[PDB]
Structures are given as C-alpha cells and as structure tokens.
Amino acid sequence: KPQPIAAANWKCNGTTASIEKLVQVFNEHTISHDVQCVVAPTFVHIPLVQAKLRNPKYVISAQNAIAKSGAFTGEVSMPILKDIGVHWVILGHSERRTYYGETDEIVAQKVSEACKQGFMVIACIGETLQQREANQTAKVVLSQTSAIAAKLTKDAWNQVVLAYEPVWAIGTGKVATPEQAQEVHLLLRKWVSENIGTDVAAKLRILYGGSVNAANAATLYAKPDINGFLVGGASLKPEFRDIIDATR
Amino acid sequence: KPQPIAAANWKCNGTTASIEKLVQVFNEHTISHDVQCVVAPTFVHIPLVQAKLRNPKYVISAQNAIAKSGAFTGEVSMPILKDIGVHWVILGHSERRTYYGETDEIVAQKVSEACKQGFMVIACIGETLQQREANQTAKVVLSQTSAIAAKLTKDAWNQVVLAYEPVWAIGTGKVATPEQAQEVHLLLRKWVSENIGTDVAAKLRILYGGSVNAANAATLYAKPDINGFLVGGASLKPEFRDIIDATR
C-alpha cells in the first residue's frame, strides 16, 4: 500500500482553548510509522495551529478555497493560503456540495486550479442514501471522479488524494462496513488504472470517511484498497491518536 | 450626524507582506476626529492584523460568517469569531448575494443571529443596474431592508450599520453621484424612522460603498444622510487614510 493518510476535518468547530489542548495531545503522541497526518482547522484557526503544532508527521490543510484572489468577499483563495504556508486543501466535501452549491464542475475546476498551484488536494466524492438504494453508487462516484479527471493531466494525480465518503455515513454514526468501503475503493482504483494509468492507480491514496472512530478504523484499514481516513467528529477528540495508529 | 464609519473591505486579497506594510501605514496615520475605522481582512489574515494593528480608532471585522458552529466544512461561525476577538461582521455583501446564494432571507437570518450574539453588523443592500433602469431602486432597497428588519427587535438596531452599495458601482469605477446616494440614504432613513423608530433612525449609520476613493469621498460625505463608507479597492492602498479623513 502507498503511504497512508489520517486527516482531521475539524469542520466549523473549535475555540482557541480547545484547539490548544488538542494540539498538545497530538504533539505528545509519538507516531512511529510512515503516515501523513493532516489537520484542517477553520481558516481563522490556521495561524494558531501553525504556531502550536509541532508533531513532524502533520501538515495543515484548509477546508475549502477558491482559485483566485479578487473581489470575492468572504472567501479565501489558493494564493492566499500558499503565501501563509498552507499547501493542502480539502475540496468538494459533501457539506459544500449540499449546502453551498458546489457542483461537479465547480469541484473539478477547484481541484484543477489547486493542482496547478502546487497544492496537495483531498477531493471528496460519495453517494447519497437514495443513490445507494437505487443501486447507483458506482455510477455516481465514477461520474464525480471523471469530472475531476477531465480537468487534470496525468502528472497532476501525484497531488490528488481521493476521499470516498458516503453521504449517509457522514456524522450519522452509520459507518460503512469494511466490505462496502472496499467495494467502492476497488472500483475507483480500477477506473483510475484503466483511464489514467496503472502507475497512478498503484500510488493513489483513497481514503474512507464517514463515522470513522478509533474502534472501527483498524478493520477498515485492513482492506487492501483503503489508504486511510478523513475523520470529522472523532478528530476533535484524543482518540484521533488511535485512528492514526490504526494505519500501521 | 452620528459617528461616521470608514470600513475597509479587503475582499479576497492580501499577502502577509502587503498586509504588514499597509497596517503600518494605517498605524502611523493619526486620526484626530471621532470615527470608527473598520478593517475586514480575509479569515486567515485576521490573526496577523490583530497582532499588528495598533491604531486605536480601528476594529477588525470578518467579511462573512455563519450563525452556528458545526458540520459546515469550509465556513467560519459567529461563535468562533467571537472567541478570537472579532465582534464585527459584514453580511449580505453583493458578491455573496450574487455568487454564493445569499438570498434576502439568508442575509436576514445571519444578521439576526449576529445581533443576538453581540456583533456589530454591516448589512449590505443595493440595486442592480437593471433594477435602477427599471425605476425599482427604492422598492429593491426597501425590500432588502425590511427583510432584515423583520427578524430584528428595535433594540438590535443599535448594533446594525447599513451599507448601501449599488451593484453597478462596486469595483467598476462608476461611483454614484452624491445626489444619487443621498436620495437612497434619505429614503432608507425615512423608512427606518417610520417603521422602527425616530430615535433609531437618528442614530443609524448608513454608509455608501461602490468605487469610493480619496478624491470623491469628501463630496459624498458632505451629504446629510451619508455616514461613511464601505471601501473595497481603495482600502488596499495608502489613500484609505484620506478616505478616513474625508469623514471629518
């Protein structure tokens, strides 16, 4: 397997005091294996986390961005993030697709621009409960992935991490079973192998997210095509340490 | 007139180096009259500006927010801002109404929540060129204002600043004439006086924005119902000092 990733999506949460305490916990956890840890604070907390986070296995990610600076009140651009030292971004999270109008073509454009600007990108894909029950999971996730792929060159895939998060698993407590997740990860990896390249597919990290916790992480990671996790609720807690260690 | 406001909406712009230089300029400008200056950096630059800005006439504002923390990847909430020391927010900017789906009811809800949480709010309203040419300016701005008003109590208006920004003037170089701006500000103030209270109307700041620069600011401020400015492009430049001083 390629190098795993354990990514903490703090979403729209945190106070300075709670973040200081949690970062201390993460700093004091010695990670002995090869894993890339990622923490994605809210924009306003990025400087605090940059100042306090010292664990060498971690990088900081933004939770969203727009491609260019300019007259976009309220938004944060990729050049602005790069200038402050952030070169990872999560794009296309279900919450943004649902609440904030991010269509496949908007996500694909953002991913393309992030790659051109040198970011590592965690690009999120996943089906809704209605799509799953209609036996459309594969069509949906492949359509989301091919929309992204259409805007990328083969070289750019070195910067891409895919995160499969069934929408019905996000925040609900209803994690996908290892078999459910593995079926989708395998389908995605096969599509990448056939449509992009077998060398790309072998090195591509495909993360699972949606109700990962420290108790279910190891049995997800045991599956051959799962390369780590994008973690929401449990990444606000000290048991994120055990999620990291489940990628051994 | 009530205390004027000179507000800098930096939009999605800045680097750490350019911000450090501009904040130094603002720090070294001694303001002798009673004015509230506001600077609204991007979220990621708020901590930098908090650290460097020392001019006592300034407060820091966010350019947007959502009302509550939670599972809203990419967004920043009002409690998070309050915790970091930011208690001003711009809401309903034209760019967010246009690009990011903020309807009158979304803006009104955000304004209401911000007021409940103790923020000072700069709430933006304004008509498009098509609405102006259809002689709908008054209907539009009063409809936007009454949507906000419907969610507020009379007491909350102490926290509200209205910013009238004709959409056709934002970023285009085509500033409203003093007479155009004054006509709308007077109509707004009259509506507030009749529908909210004459005491509220007398103390309410109504700012103009849309292509304000240091040369046109003084002839806008001379009008009786203009209480300052929301400034985009020119607030990234040293001549913001002269915009502030045009509110004497």
mmCIF file of N, CA, C and O in Angstrom, chain A residues 71-124:
data_model
loop_
_atom_site.group_PDB
_atom_site.id
_atom_site.type_symbol
_atom_site.label_atom_id
_atom_site.label_comp_id
_atom_site.label_asym_id
_atom_site.label_seq_id
_atom_site.Cartn_x
_atom_site.Cartn_y
_atom_site.Cartn_z
ATOM 1 N N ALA A 71 -12.286 39.975 -6.002
ATOM 2 C CA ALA A 71 -13.467 40.581 -5.412
ATOM 3 C C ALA A 71 -14.478 39.491 -5.062
ATOM 4 O O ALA A 71 -15.517 39.319 -5.671
ATOM 5 N N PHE A 72 -14.116 38.715 -4.032
ATOM 6 C CA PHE A 72 -14.917 37.586 -3.575
ATOM 7 C C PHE A 72 -15.045 37.697 -2.056
ATOM 8 O O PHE A 72 -14.420 36.942 -1.293
ATOM 9 N N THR A 73 -15.855 38.629 -1.610
ATOM 10 C CA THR A 73 -15.983 38.907 -0.189
ATOM 11 C C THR A 73 -16.348 37.640 0.549
ATOM 12 O O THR A 73 -17.290 36.939 0.178
ATOM 13 N N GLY A 74 -15.586 37.363 1.602
ATOM 14 C CA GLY A 74 -15.809 36.240 2.466
ATOM 15 C C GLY A 74 -15.007 35.029 2.149
ATOM 16 O O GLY A 74 -14.916 34.149 3.006
ATOM 17 N N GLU A 75 -14.429 34.924 0.980
ATOM 18 C CA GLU A 75 -13.758 33.706 0.561
ATOM 19 C C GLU A 75 -12.257 33.839 0.739
ATOM 20 O O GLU A 75 -11.712 34.935 0.846
ATOM 21 N N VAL A 76 -11.581 32.699 0.735
ATOM 22 C CA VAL A 76 -10.139 32.641 0.858
ATOM 23 C C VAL A 76 -9.591 31.927 -0.358
ATOM 24 O O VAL A 76 -10.065 30.846 -0.711
ATOM 25 N N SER A 77 -8.589 32.504 -0.996
ATOM 26 C CA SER A 77 -8.065 31.944 -2.230
ATOM 27 C C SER A 77 -6.846 31.084 -2.014
ATOM 28 O O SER A 77 -6.141 31.170 -1.020
ATOM 29 N N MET A 78 -6.577 30.295 -3.041
ATOM 30 C CA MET A 78 -5.407 29.438 -3.041
ATOM 31 C C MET A 78 -4.106 30.209 -2.952
ATOM 32 O O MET A 78 -3.236 29.809 -2.168
ATOM 33 N N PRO A 79 -3.913 31.319 -3.655
ATOM 34 C CA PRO A 79 -2.672 32.074 -3.465
ATOM 35 C C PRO A 79 -2.496 32.591 -2.069
ATOM 36 O O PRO A 79 -1.379 32.634 -1.552
ATOM 37 N N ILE A 80 -3.584 32.989 -1.423
ATOM 38 C CA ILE A 80 -3.501 33.469 -0.062
ATOM 39 C C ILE A 80 -3.063 32.362 0.871
ATOM 40 O O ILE A 80 -2.231 32.575 1.752
ATOM 41 N N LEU A 81 -3.609 31.160 0.683
ATOM 42 C CA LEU A 81 -3.208 30.037 1.512
ATOM 43 C C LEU A 81 -1.756 29.703 1.286
ATOM 44 O O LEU A 81 -1.019 29.461 2.243
ATOM 45 N N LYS A 82 -1.322 29.667 0.032
ATOM 46 C CA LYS A 82 0.073 29.331 -0.243
ATOM 47 C C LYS A 82 1.002 30.306 0.436
ATOM 48 O O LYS A 82 2.027 29.915 1.003
ATOM 49 N N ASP A 83 0.655 31.579 0.398
ATOM 50 C CA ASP A 83 1.501 32.610 0.990
ATOM 51 C C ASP A 83 1.632 32.436 2.484
ATOM 52 O O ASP A 83 2.686 32.753 3.059
ATOM 53 N N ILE A 84 0.588 31.931 3.150
ATOM 54 C CA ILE A 84 0.647 31.716 4.584
ATOM 55 C C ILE A 84 1.217 30.354 4.919
ATOM 56 O O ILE A 84 1.364 30.047 6.103
ATOM 57 N N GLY A 85 1.576 29.554 3.945
ATOM 58 C CA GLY A 85 2.231 28.299 4.207
ATOM 59 C C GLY A 85 1.343 27.078 4.187
ATOM 60 O O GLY A 85 1.782 26.015 4.633
ATOM 61 N N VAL A 86 0.127 27.184 3.686
ATOM 62 C CA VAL A 86 -0.789 26.063 3.627
ATOM 63 C C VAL A 86 -0.817 25.600 2.195
ATOM 64 O O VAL A 86 -1.156 26.374 1.288
ATOM 65 N N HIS A 87 -0.491 24.344 1.978
ATOM 66 C CA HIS A 87 -0.436 23.794 0.642
ATOM 67 C C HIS A 87 -1.173 22.476 0.536
ATOM 68 O O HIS A 87 -0.920 21.716 -0.396
ATOM 69 N N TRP A 88 -2.121 22.233 1.439
ATOM 70 C CA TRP A 88 -3.106 21.171 1.342
ATOM 71 C C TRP A 88 -4.475 21.797 1.423
ATOM 72 O O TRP A 88 -4.672 22.797 2.113
ATOM 73 N N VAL A 89 -5.418 21.224 0.682
ATOM 74 C CA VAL A 89 -6.791 21.697 0.736
ATOM 75 C C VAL A 89 -7.713 20.529 0.516
ATOM 76 O O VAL A 89 -7.418 19.623 -0.264
ATOM 77 N N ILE A 90 -8.812 20.553 1.234
ATOM 78 C CA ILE A 90 -9.935 19.656 1.020
ATOM 79 C C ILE A 90 -10.900 20.351 0.083
ATOM 80 O O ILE A 90 -11.254 21.506 0.302
ATOM 81 N N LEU A 91 -11.335 19.655 -0.943
ATOM 82 C CA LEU A 91 -12.233 20.223 -1.921
ATOM 83 C C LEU A 91 -13.383 19.272 -2.195
ATOM 84 O O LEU A 91 -13.212 18.054 -2.258
ATOM 85 N N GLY A 92 -14.552 19.841 -2.386
ATOM 86 C CA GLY A 92 -15.711 19.055 -2.745
ATOM 87 C C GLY A 92 -16.316 18.266 -1.624
ATOM 88 O O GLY A 92 -17.075 17.328 -1.871
ATOM 89 N N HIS A 93 -16.103 18.674 -0.392
ATOM 90 C CA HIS A 93 -16.749 17.997 0.708
ATOM 91 C C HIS A 93 -18.248 18.036 0.522
ATOM 92 O O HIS A 93 -18.814 19.007 0.046
ATOM 93 N N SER A 94 -18.878 16.936 0.926
ATOM 94 C CA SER A 94 -20.316 16.795 0.802
ATOM 95 C C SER A 94 -21.068 17.998 1.341
ATOM 96 O O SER A 94 -22.059 18.422 0.743
ATOM 97 N N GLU A 95 -20.627 18.560 2.459
ATOM 98 C CA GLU A 95 -21.310 19.700 3.037
ATOM 99 C C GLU A 95 -21.295 20.885 2.091
ATOM 100 O O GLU A 95 -22.266 21.626 2.032
ATOM 101 N N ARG A 96 -20.248 21.043 1.310
ATOM 102 C CA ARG A 96 -20.191 22.145 0.371
ATOM 103 C C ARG A 96 -20.978 21.830 -0.882
ATOM 104 O O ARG A 96 -21.559 22.734 -1.484
ATOM 105 N N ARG A 97 -20.978 20.578 -1.320
ATOM 106 C CA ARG A 97 -21.800 20.180 -2.457
ATOM 107 C C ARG A 97 -23.271 20.362 -2.141
ATOM 108 O O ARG A 97 -24.059 20.744 -3.017
ATOM 109 N N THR A 98 -23.658 20.085 -0.898
ATOM 110 C CA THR A 98 -25.057 20.115 -0.478
ATOM 111 C C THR A 98 -25.491 21.542 -0.168
ATOM 112 O O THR A 98 -26.411 22.073 -0.802
ATOM 113 N N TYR A 99 -24.798 22.206 0.755
ATOM 114 C CA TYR A 99 -25.255 23.494 1.275
ATOM 115 C C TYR A 99 -24.805 24.677 0.457
ATOM 116 O O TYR A 99 -25.469 25.718 0.497
ATOM 117 N N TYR A 100 -23.676 24.580 -0.242
ATOM 118 C CA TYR A 100 -23.006 25.766 -0.768
ATOM 119 C C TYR A 100 -22.786 25.684 -2.270
ATOM 120 O O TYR A 100 -21.871 26.323 -2.799
ATOM 121 N N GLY A 101 -23.605 24.891 -2.959
ATOM 122 C CA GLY A 101 -23.722 24.952 -4.399
ATOM 123 C C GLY A 101 -22.556 24.435 -5.189
ATOM 124 O O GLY A 101 -22.417 24.790 -6.361
ATOM 125 N N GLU A 102 -21.717 23.574 -4.611
ATOM 126 C CA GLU A 102 -20.559 23.092 -5.347
ATOM 127 C C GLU A 102 -20.951 21.879 -6.178
ATOM 128 O O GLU A 102 -21.056 20.767 -5.684
ATOM 129 N N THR A 103 -21.116 22.110 -7.471
ATOM 130 C CA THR A 103 -21.424 21.070 -8.429
ATOM 131 C C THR A 103 -20.152 20.341 -8.807
ATOM 132 O O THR A 103 -19.042 20.763 -8.493
ATOM 133 N N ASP A 104 -20.307 19.255 -9.541
ATOM 134 C CA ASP A 104 -19.140 18.536 -10.011
ATOM 135 C C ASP A 104 -18.235 19.443 -10.820
ATOM 136 O O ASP A 104 -17.005 19.357 -10.717
ATOM 137 N N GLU A 105 -18.800 20.332 -11.629
ATOM 138 C CA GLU A 105 -17.924 21.158 -12.450
ATOM 139 C C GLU A 105 -17.213 22.223 -11.620
ATOM 140 O O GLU A 105 -16.077 22.598 -11.929
ATOM 141 N N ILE A 106 -17.849 22.715 -10.562
ATOM 142 C CA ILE A 106 -17.160 23.634 -9.665
ATOM 143 C C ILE A 106 -16.046 22.924 -8.920
ATOM 144 O O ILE A 106 -14.935 23.438 -8.826
ATOM 145 N N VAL A 107 -16.317 21.735 -8.405
ATOM 146 C CA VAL A 107 -15.289 20.981 -7.696
ATOM 147 C C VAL A 107 -14.127 20.668 -8.619
ATOM 148 O O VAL A 107 -12.965 20.832 -8.265
ATOM 149 N N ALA A 108 -14.434 20.208 -9.833
ATOM 150 C CA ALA A 108 -13.382 19.847 -10.766
ATOM 151 C C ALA A 108 -12.518 21.050 -11.105
ATOM 152 O O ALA A 108 -11.295 20.935 -11.182
ATOM 153 N N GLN A 109 -13.132 22.212 -11.281
ATOM 154 C CA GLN A 109 -12.353 23.406 -11.549
ATOM 155 C C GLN A 109 -11.466 23.760 -10.366
ATOM 156 O O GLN A 109 -10.296 24.104 -10.543
ATOM 157 N N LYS A 110 -11.994 23.661 -9.146
ATOM 158 C CA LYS A 110 -11.179 23.972 -7.979
ATOM 159 C C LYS A 110 -10.023 23.015 -7.864
ATOM 160 O O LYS A 110 -8.911 23.415 -7.556
ATOM 161 N N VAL A 111 -10.272 21.732 -8.062
ATOM 162 C CA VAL A 111 -9.202 20.752 -7.953
ATOM 163 C C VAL A 111 -8.114 21.031 -8.980
ATOM 164 O O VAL A 111 -6.921 20.991 -8.680
ATOM 165 N N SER A 112 -8.516 21.321 -10.211
ATOM 166 C CA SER A 112 -7.554 21.601 -11.269
ATOM 167 C C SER A 112 -6.687 22.800 -10.911
ATOM 168 O O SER A 112 -5.463 22.772 -11.068
ATOM 169 N N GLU A 113 -7.319 23.860 -10.427
ATOM 170 C CA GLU A 113 -6.566 25.045 -10.067
ATOM 171 C C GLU A 113 -5.647 24.779 -8.895
ATOM 172 O O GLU A 113 -4.520 25.273 -8.858
ATOM 173 N N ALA A 114 -6.111 24.017 -7.906
ATOM 174 C CA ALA A 114 -5.263 23.716 -6.775
ATOM 175 C C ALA A 114 -4.046 22.948 -7.230
ATOM 176 O O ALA A 114 -2.936 23.204 -6.779
ATOM 177 N N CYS A 115 -4.242 21.991 -8.120
ATOM 178 C CA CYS A 115 -3.096 21.229 -8.583
ATOM 179 C C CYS A 115 -2.125 22.125 -9.333
ATOM 180 O O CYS A 115 -0.915 22.019 -9.152
ATOM 181 N N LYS A 116 -2.639 23.036 -10.155
ATOM 182 C CA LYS A 116 -1.752 23.916 -10.908
ATOM 183 C C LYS A 116 -0.962 24.781 -9.965
ATOM 184 O O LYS A 116 0.172 25.162 -10.271
ATOM 185 N N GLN A 117 -1.535 25.116 -8.809
ATOM 186 C CA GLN A 117 -0.873 25.961 -7.849
ATOM 187 C C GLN A 117 -0.057 25.186 -6.843
ATOM 188 O O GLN A 117 0.440 25.781 -5.885
ATOM 189 N N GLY A 118 0.123 23.896 -7.042
ATOM 190 C CA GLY A 118 1.048 23.145 -6.229
ATOM 191 C C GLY A 118 0.478 22.594 -4.953
ATOM 192 O O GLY A 118 1.241 22.164 -4.090
ATOM 193 N N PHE A 119 -0.834 22.565 -4.806
ATOM 194 C CA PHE A 119 -1.428 22.003 -3.604
ATOM 195 C C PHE A 119 -1.484 20.494 -3.684
ATOM 196 O O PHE A 119 -1.599 19.909 -4.761
ATOM 197 N N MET A 120 -1.462 19.873 -2.522
ATOM 198 C CA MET A 120 -1.996 18.540 -2.364
ATOM 199 C C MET A 120 -3.477 18.704 -2.085
ATOM 200 O O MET A 120 -3.873 19.575 -1.291
ATOM 201 N N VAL A 121 -4.280 17.908 -2.749
ATOM 202 C CA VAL A 121 -5.725 18.047 -2.697
ATOM 203 C C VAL A 121 -6.333 16.772 -2.169
ATOM 204 O O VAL A 121 -6.055 15.687 -2.688
ATOM 205 N N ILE A 122 -7.233 16.901 -1.219
ATOM 206 C CA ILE A 122 -8.111 15.803 -0.827
ATOM 207 C C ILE A 122 -9.446 16.102 -1.459
ATOM 208 O O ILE A 122 -10.139 17.040 -1.047
ATOM 209 N N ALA A 123 -9.792 15.349 -2.478
ATOM 210 C CA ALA A 123 -11.005 15.576 -3.232
ATOM 211 C C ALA A 123 -12.052 14.577 -2.786
ATOM 212 O O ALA A 123 -11.807 13.370 -2.831
ATOM 213 N N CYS A 124 -13.215 15.058 -2.390
ATOM 214 C CA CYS A 124 -14.232 14.215 -1.783
ATOM 215 C C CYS A 124 -15.303 13.830 -2.782
ATOM 216 O O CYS A 124 -15.761 14.658 -3.566
#
